[PDB]
Amino acid sequence: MDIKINDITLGNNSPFVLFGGINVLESLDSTLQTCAHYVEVTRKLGIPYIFKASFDKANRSSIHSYRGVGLEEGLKIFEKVKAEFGIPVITDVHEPHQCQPVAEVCDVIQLPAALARQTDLVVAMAKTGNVVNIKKPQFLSPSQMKNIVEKFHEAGNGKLILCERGSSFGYDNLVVDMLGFGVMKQTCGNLPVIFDVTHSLQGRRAQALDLALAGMATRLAGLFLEALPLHLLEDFLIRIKALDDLIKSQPIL
Amino acid sequence: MDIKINDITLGNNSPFVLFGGINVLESLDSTLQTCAHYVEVTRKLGIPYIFKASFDKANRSSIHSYRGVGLEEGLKIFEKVKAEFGIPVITDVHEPHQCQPVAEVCDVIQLPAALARQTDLVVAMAKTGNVVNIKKPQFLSPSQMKNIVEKFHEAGNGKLILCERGSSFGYDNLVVDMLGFGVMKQTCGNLPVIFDVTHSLQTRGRRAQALDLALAGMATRLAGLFLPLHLLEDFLIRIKALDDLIKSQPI
Amino acid sequence: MDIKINDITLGNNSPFVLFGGINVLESLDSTLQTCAHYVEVTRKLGIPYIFKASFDKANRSSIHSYRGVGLEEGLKIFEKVKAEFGIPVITDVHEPHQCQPVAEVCDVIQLPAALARQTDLVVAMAKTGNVVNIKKPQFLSPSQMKNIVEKFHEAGNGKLILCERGSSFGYDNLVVDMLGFGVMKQTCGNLPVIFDVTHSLQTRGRRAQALDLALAGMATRLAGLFLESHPALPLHLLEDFLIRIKALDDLIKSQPI
Amino acid sequence: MDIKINDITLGNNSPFVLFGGINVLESLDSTLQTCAHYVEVTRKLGIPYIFKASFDKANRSSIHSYRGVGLEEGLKIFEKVKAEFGIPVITDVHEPHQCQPVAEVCDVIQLPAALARQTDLVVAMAKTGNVVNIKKPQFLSPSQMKNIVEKFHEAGNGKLILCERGSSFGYDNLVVDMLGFGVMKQTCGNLPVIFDVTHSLQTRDASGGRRAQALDLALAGMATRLAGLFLESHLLEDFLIRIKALDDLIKSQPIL
Ligand SMILES: [Cl-]
Ligand SMILES: [Cl-]
Ligand code: NA
């Protein structure tokens, strides 16, 4: 099943979509600069692009680390990105009360991995009718994603994306199970599946590339990143696009 | 470091405290009845006891499933338990705004494992000044518990309990690492460590298993245990025998 | 570092080599038939090929379970394969005393995963001077592979291939860490690394799975692929499967590191 | 099911048996000296004791690490340990042809974890009729131990001990699943189960150090009611006092 996000088609048999941007929204000028760079590079390569950032980082390394600009300013910055570049945007939500005001600006809203089984948040997100990105917790198997999907469906929303972020592997390490993509496709109605390569990785550039190419080889709707340096983005995306283009060009069976 | 909860001393070198009760609060009468049974059994064995229940089930089977009595009715039930039995109580909280009104009634407030890194909830719980039970997520190593402890300390609360619930082991399965208890004691200032044997097993009759696992964990020297046939009694008799032996040996 | 196996160049930046064949040697006719099919398919696709089979099942669930042809009969079958097709062959060895007579016939000899730390077998394999395929145990991390490599080097043999077969993941399940390939390459002198996709899946239709997993691994830039098929992928699907692996391998190998 | 090893009863309901000694046999005098220390400490505490060592250690971390005095001298040293102290002994075998001559002298023979599914070794060990200690591989679940047991039974030997060593847990680390003991007991006819605490720990890093760890882990395993404790290469006495306290408590109580 494909999902339309403005003029983008997102789907497991469609050209990959890049979801990228910054960690925490901290100012208008810096956000617009970064977004501009992603926009120019993805336009040059013909890669569909959705800008990502958090306005309210709920899990901070220390209490008093800056959470971001907050809801009211964060949504203004997202409106300005949409106005200036004409692209969709994505951001996470942490409380039921945030769902409506965030959904009425942001094209995709995201269920954080830690909150993925919090029924009240699922229902509130569902009721927006927006496109939803579900972050797979690292302790949840791919066959348990169906239960989360089922709850969204019960609440009346089937515009769901599944986002792989790796699985707990002993202490501290994560491993990405390349077979979990297919399990999620088979058990969840072939909803779009995207791969968060960044938060799957605890030099690092050779690693992120190897992992991103391996996951995209399995036929995915998109790639989700934060840890990549901005100027090397083009070389990186050239390689992902080469592989995606090859894979998607071949029939499934 | 010991923590006093009314007349109970909770600590890794003190007689173990049992934290037990029911999953979700459903009614006053059922709750009082269940509590009464725990109270009678723990009193006759001489085991300190804290009653546990949730007022709200945050992860439901269907969007349509009983959520439990809710905050307002849940707190009235807890007030009734405290009045009738004179024991401390423990419950979990899911949102920052709930922390203050819950902490007015409940002796121990509990940080759910899924929410253990949600900074706002941590701060709001810390600011109550109450005793806090931190549920260790199954994807977090024991050496990371110090980072949660550090946050509570910055927010001005050091009355923390660490609660082992098992570690992810492949898909849909847990294992308890018996060495994690000592790692948490060493790296977190010897705060009380308790063992949630029940959640540690939900992925695996089951009575032999819970006993084996509880005895094994309590052999490592812990502050507490978190969970016609008299099954609770027979179980606690054996835990207390081991706990008493282990606590009588020098460190 | 590349390794030459007759006319084949095996290396992490060379076109991938297929190591394939059957699980256990059962009959001479059935072996020649299966091999003939692998040979015809790989030749048409321009994929270098090494024929694989075991002459003995060492590890079966029952003491009476069928174990195969045995050493003496197995080596006569391997000689026949080499004579008829002119290709290299690969087989596993289980005891030190077998290494020399097996190495006299088989181009590549294979250290089973369960025996990978058995020092007497390592030393006897190393002393043959043959190319060795090391099966990475499922309990060994990729950074510990260097310790096995070090032992072969200590015993005077550096013609070593590292073969990924998946990692233990809870009870009775495996996961393939796509990053372990690059860890092996960096820590083991960039020796050829190959992927045994088949054993990596035996704990999990299955054709879609093997393809996804094989593609994902080969995306990381590997010297080869190691698999089984039965009359295990069905033998008839081999061509379509390899067409896809080769398309990806060719794309990946054409990009610079 | 209990197993008699001379005058020792090994069983999940019997006082625990200690299996310990040295890593590799090097010389008669040094072996006797070490064994004499284990013997004096275990006699003083009333703990049954089986001396362990390798004569040809086949899995050492270097190819030139000493494997031991070898089969002929190793067995002579074992005979002397038996004659001098009157205790049973245990050693590991890695090749089929070694099983018979080893079993002439060593009371218990041990199947290395890595070789546990190697059918030819299993059969050759079974055929000795001796007591066998099966080391559980770290990549094998406790419910797969029944398949190893079945093969020994098929080959005509039921005097089997199951030895826990931990399970793979991510890369490098091992974790001991305290529920695996009960699974092995339920599925394998309640054969004796012993715990190799040492192996279970060597992958683990660093007020306590490794001694506090080995003690915590040993006590946790013995709390599940086990036939014995198995150690690898004044502290032994203090350690055994604490294990014995717990073992005595646990074994004094009925199962159910
Ligand atoms: Cl994110
Ligand atoms: Cl193989
Ligand atoms: Na919207």
PDB file of C-alpha atoms and ligand atoms in Angstrom, chain C residues 23 52 54 92 110 135 196 199 226 228, ligand 2:
ATOM      1  CA  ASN C  23      24.759 -30.520   1.573  1.00  0.00           C
ATOM      2  CA  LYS C  52      30.822 -27.594  -2.439  1.00  0.00           C
ATOM      3  CA  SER C  54      30.386 -32.613   2.538  1.00  0.00           C
ATOM      4  CA  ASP C  92      34.940 -29.627   5.254  1.00  0.00           C
ATOM      5  CA  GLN C 110      36.854 -25.924   5.406  1.00  0.00           C
ATOM      6  CA  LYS C 135      33.278 -20.875   9.222  1.00  0.00           C
ATOM      7  CA  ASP C 196      26.832 -18.376   3.957  1.00  0.00           C
ATOM      8  CA  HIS C 199      22.925 -21.623   7.404  1.00  0.00           C
ATOM      9  CA  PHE C 226      28.001 -19.559  -0.130  1.00  0.00           C
ATOM     10  CA  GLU C 228      22.948 -24.847  -0.770  1.00  0.00           C
TER      11      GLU C 228
HETATM   12 CL    CL E   2      28.679 -25.955   5.371  1.00  0.00          CL
END
